[PDB]
């Protein structure tokens, strides 16, 4: 999965 803009 491409890392999202928030955790």
């Amino acid at each position, epitope marked *: *999965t*491409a*890392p*999202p*803009a*928030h*955790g």
Partner: antibody
Amino acid sequence: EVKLHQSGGGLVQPGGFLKISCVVSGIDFSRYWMSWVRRAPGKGLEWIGEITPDSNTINYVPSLKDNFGISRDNAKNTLFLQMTKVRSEDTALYFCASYYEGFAYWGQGTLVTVSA
Amino acid sequence: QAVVTQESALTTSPGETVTLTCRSSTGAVITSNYANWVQEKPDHLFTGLIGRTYNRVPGVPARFSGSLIGDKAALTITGAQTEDEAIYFCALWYSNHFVFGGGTKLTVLK
């Protein structure tokens, strides 16, 4: 090579309904979070919502929860934005965006005009 | 109804360093606000610069860096170029949604 191609939009009357599409190519769509964002005249960037690759999490700014619906079809590499019971203040340029660390990839934008 | 506050406008010039800040109405900006910075150039041309306070989007020049100075998130440009004249938007995460600030019009004096 990475392309977020938007289509739809245009003119809609107050109270009306409109669905925007964003077809992704150049990346494995099914592993990217996707987001919808808008830019209205005289107003800053506004984040509408986002959706996980598996569609099991769909997040919205609460004030737009009732007039926008986000979905995706990974088999057709397409992200959707349903505009529901549109208001005059929904006139804006709408952009799909894909997450990679931040707002990494961007569509060309879709103009939606709400006028009676 | 969280509000994200940025400087309305700042002026730098080519080769200089400038810092932009982003403040939360709910209190100190912390890691779980996952500050994102997005650049708007003319023609409604948007570019993501920083995600999760510190991380460069791939391809972003090294002259862009994020930070947490005090209670605020910050974007620093070291060695500004004419191409950096833009509106810079900061978005803060509030548990289940992003809120963008009003944006900083950055002038790189021509």
